[PDB]
Swiss-Prot record, chain B:
Ranges in a coiled coil: none
Protein's name according to its UniProt entry: Small ribosomal subunit protein uS5
UniProt similarity note: Belongs to the universal ribosomal protein uS5 family.
InterPro entries: Ribosomal_Su5_D2-typ_SF, Ribosomal_uS5, Ribosomal_uS5_bac-type, Ribosomal_uS5_C, Ribosomal_uS5_N, Ribosomal_uS5_N_CS, Ribsml_uS5_D2-typ_fold_subgr
Protein source organism: Escherichia coli O1:K1 / APEC
Curated annotation (Swiss-Prot), chain C:
Entry annotated with the keyword Ribonucleoprotein: yes
UniProt GO molecular function: rRNA binding; structural constituent of ribosome
GO biological process: translation
Keywords for this protein: Ribonucleoprotein, Ribosomal protein, RNA-binding, rRNA-binding
Keyword Ribonucleoprotein: yes
Gene: rpsO
Function in brief: One of the primary rRNA binding proteins, it binds directly to 16S rRNA where it helps nucleate assembly of the platform of the 30S subunit by binding and bridging several RNA helices of the 16S rRNA.
The protein's name in its UniProt record: Small ribosomal subunit protein uS15
Species this chain originates from: Escherichia coli O157:H7
Length: 129, 149, 86, 217
RNA sequence: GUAAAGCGCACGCAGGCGGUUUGUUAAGUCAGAUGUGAAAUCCCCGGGCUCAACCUGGGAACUGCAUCUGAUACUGGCAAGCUUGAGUCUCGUAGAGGGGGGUAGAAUUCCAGGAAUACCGGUGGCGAAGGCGGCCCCCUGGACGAAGACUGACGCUCAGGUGCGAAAGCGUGGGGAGCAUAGUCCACGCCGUAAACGAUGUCGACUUGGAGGUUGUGCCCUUGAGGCGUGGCUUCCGGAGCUAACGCGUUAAGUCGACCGCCUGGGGAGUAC
């Protein structure tokens, strides 16, 4: 990317959700390992392998259950220059809470249940559905 | 059984070498009150024969849509080719606070508790296409959980 | 211009061999190649086409001087001593 | 399997919707492999007989030229249906009024099964043989039919994709054989076998027909 | 993109916006309380007028600002780095990019010379646009390719701002054929105008494609006019997706991100002051 590494990643993934390729790959900062170690665990994709040490870079495995593809409607919201630092008792539940809401907390990125369990919100990263 | 409903009827003309031959259109939907809905379209040269042919158009091609509590549960946005439809799930006992064409498709699904809005164009041919796409895109909590894990 | 007199001015500024694009070596090569090109615009005085190509690198001459300014105030003054700038 | 015989046709100009099923190009043409298709040469037979045990009807939609005899080889001797010639628009979705176009026919069959064709003196009976040439052309395996086709079988997906476009429209399973340069995403039970080369088109139709008599069980 | 709407085009100042790793601070933000947000209205359980309006007890809420304590994932200032964004060097390659200088005919009126290409000349090709075509040298402009090398974010964008600005007109100084009687033509000054219409800001990254253009250059009996790549830009039809259609469609208008210009019914009107 030039001027957001995480926004321009989220174009790269769901273009794989429009031709149903197997593996996708983007140049991977240490933040970017902490991105898809949430999407795997909540079940939206399957497996990933970092590789490279002068170009640290990922091998994400997609997940399309049918002709239907699992990662339906992912959206970045906090785009740079429009930071929305949510207080935690405003929190965006995604699609009546049926999805997950990736929030950049202190204690990590892994965020469904920061509403009650962790107990501190922050900058939204992206809605996920 | 099923349940019909009209939408409208126009004053569709035509032009031949002689004069102005008219026609009539007939927009209907069909849905049994349990979740499956369908629609059709049919013309004629008079009024009542148009309905008769368009009513069978909807008695096939009824699409499978699941409901939750006589209502929707999660806010899909529906758009089809001229118009935007914004359906928010709401409480029980709320009526279908809705505009034109989607009233006909919601009181045939079994849907009875939705507040919703038509956002842009108000042309009832293209409105009734969108909300059927709006209910097509939805997912029940079974479709949530069984697909992700 | 590009090959001959640049080859005698390259090692006049390098902290070692082949450090060519370092910012000290950069501007002193470049500012030299604005004086000599201004001999070409000492006359001809109607080449409004090429004059922006001069106007291109005169602004970039001030651009990399900011990179000396924001990093090392010492090395900034050292080459504008050796070039007599501003 | 037997596909040392049949491997390739259909030169370089291609559709890139057929990415997985192609093994790889070899001298300005691609090779049809075995690894993704030898399963579907007998995954199909897991679905032939159980559909046939519903007292089935399998329309061999075969409007190619090489499949003139090559699709009626063991088709109706195994008691199934076939059309090895021209195609009516909607032989499923418009079939009920094709039966109306047999309501024209089987009362005029009474002229043939009886000797009552002598009526309507022979200047009239000059032109009356011209339907009798042509009504029994496209209506071959449909006079013995009494119902909707209980399955569907298009043999090739580049000639009768007009038919497939109407076949996928109303939801009947299709045991197709698609080509290397197709629009394959209509037939949801798909085989990229060699659907050219008249020697090879017998090698699937006779391969199915050895079992479908036992398919009805 | 055609419905009102992308300045004619360029670098850029103040503005807005960050590749990549570690340290660190705690302003941005999250958390916790403690202050404080006058009472009355709004809101929820409860009282009183024969009910209701209305009067009313307590709560919640007043989305706020200031302070201590905490948190280090994002972001931000300080410190330290690494190679892909960018950029300099080497090295070749192709070319109506210009400026000056003279040159001079495949051609062409008068009694001398004003003009500027016939051919190549085209779907070529240059350039930021208006644009620019005889020939050779002179000072200069940009891009491209093949490798190496090192710089370590040094960048992208733009209100004003300043330049370059088709014709004519006008100024001052001449000419007079091709042919419009100055003017057209060179030139020094004003003038900034237009279908200055890809009626398509800019850069970046991603996604089914197919055939031709042209510039290279690696491998391969180069054994060749030639294949597979592999660069760059420009055509021609077309998937998904999109669009009111018509259509766009790896040079986007498709999925996005940062930033700038502009429009909000027609006439009066690009007019009044």
């Amino acid at each position: 990317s030039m001027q957001d590494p995480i926004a321009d990643m989220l174009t790269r993934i769901r273009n794989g959700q429009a031709a149903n390729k197997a593996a996708v790959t983007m140049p991977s900062s240490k933040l970017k390992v902490a991105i898809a170690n949430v999407l795997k665990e909540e079940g939206f994709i399957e497996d990933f392998k970092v590789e490279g040490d002068t170009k640290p870079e990922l091998e994400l495995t997609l997940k399309y259950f049918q002709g239907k593809a699992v990662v339906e409607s992912i959206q970045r919201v906090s785009r740079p220059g429009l930071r929305i630092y949510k207080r935690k008792d405003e929190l965006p539940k995604v699609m009546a809470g049926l999805g997950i809401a990736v929030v950049s907390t202190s204690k990590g990125v892994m965020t469904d249940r920061a509403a009650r369990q962790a107990g501190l919100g922050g900058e939204i990263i992206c809605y996920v559905a | 059984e099923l349940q019909e409903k009209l939408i409208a009827v126009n004053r569709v003309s035509k032009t031949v070498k002689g004069g102005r031959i008219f026609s009539f259109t007939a927009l209907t939907v069909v849905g049994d009150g349990n979740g499956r809905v369908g629609f059709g379209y049919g013309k004629a040269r008079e009024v009542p024969a148009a309905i008769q042919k368009a009513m069978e158009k909807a008695r096939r091609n009824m699409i499978n849509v699941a409901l939750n509590n006589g209502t929707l549960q999660h806010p899909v946005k529906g758009v089809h080719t001229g118009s935007r439809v914004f359906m928010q799930p709401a409480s029980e006992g709320t009526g279908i606070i809705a505009g034109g064409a989607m009233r006909a498709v919601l009181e045939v699904a079994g849907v009875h508790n939705v507040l919703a809005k038509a956002y842009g164009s108000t042309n009832p041919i293209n409105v009734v296409r969108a909300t059927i796409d709006g209910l097509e895109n939805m997912n029940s909590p079974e479709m949530v959980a069984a697909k992700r894990g | 211009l590009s090959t001959e007199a640049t080859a005698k001015i390259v090692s006049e500024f390098g902290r070692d061999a082949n450090d060519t694009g370092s910012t000290e070596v950069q501007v002193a090569l470049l500012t030299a190649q604005i004086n000599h090109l201004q001999g070409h615009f000492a006359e001809h005085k109607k080449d409004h086409h090429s004059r922006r190509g001069l106007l291109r690198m005169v602004s970039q001459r001030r651009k990399l001087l900011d990179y000396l300014k924001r990093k090392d105030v010492a090395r900034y003054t050292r080459l504008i001593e050796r070039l007599g700038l501003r | 399997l037997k596909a040392g015989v049949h491997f390739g046709h259909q030169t370089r100009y291609w559709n890139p919707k057929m990415k997985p099923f192609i093994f790889g190009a070899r001298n300005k043409v691609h090779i049809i492999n075995l690894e993704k298709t030898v399963p579907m040469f007998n995954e199909a037979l897991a679905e032939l007989n159980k559909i046939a045990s519903r007292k089935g009807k399998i329309l061999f939609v075969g409007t190619k030229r090489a499949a003139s005899e090559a699709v009626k080889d063991a088709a109706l001797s195994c008691d199934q249906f076939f059309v090895n010639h021209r195609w009516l628009g909607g032989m499923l979705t418009n079939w009920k009024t094709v039966r109306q176009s047999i309501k024209r026919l089987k009362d005029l069959e009474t002229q043939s099964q009886d000797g009552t064709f002598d009526k309507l003196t022979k200047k009239e009976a000059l032109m009356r043989t011209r339907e009798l040439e042509k009504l029994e052309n496209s209506l071959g395996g449909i006079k013995d039919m009494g119902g909707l086709p209980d399955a569907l079988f298009v043999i090739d997906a580049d000639h009768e994709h007009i038919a497939i476009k109407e076949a996928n429209n109303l939801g009947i399973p299709v045991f197709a054989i698609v080509d290397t340069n197709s629009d394959p995403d209509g037939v949801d039970f798909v085989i990229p076998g060699n659907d050219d080369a008249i020697r090879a088109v017998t090698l699937y139709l006779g391969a199915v027909a050895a079992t479908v008599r036992e398919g009805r069980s």
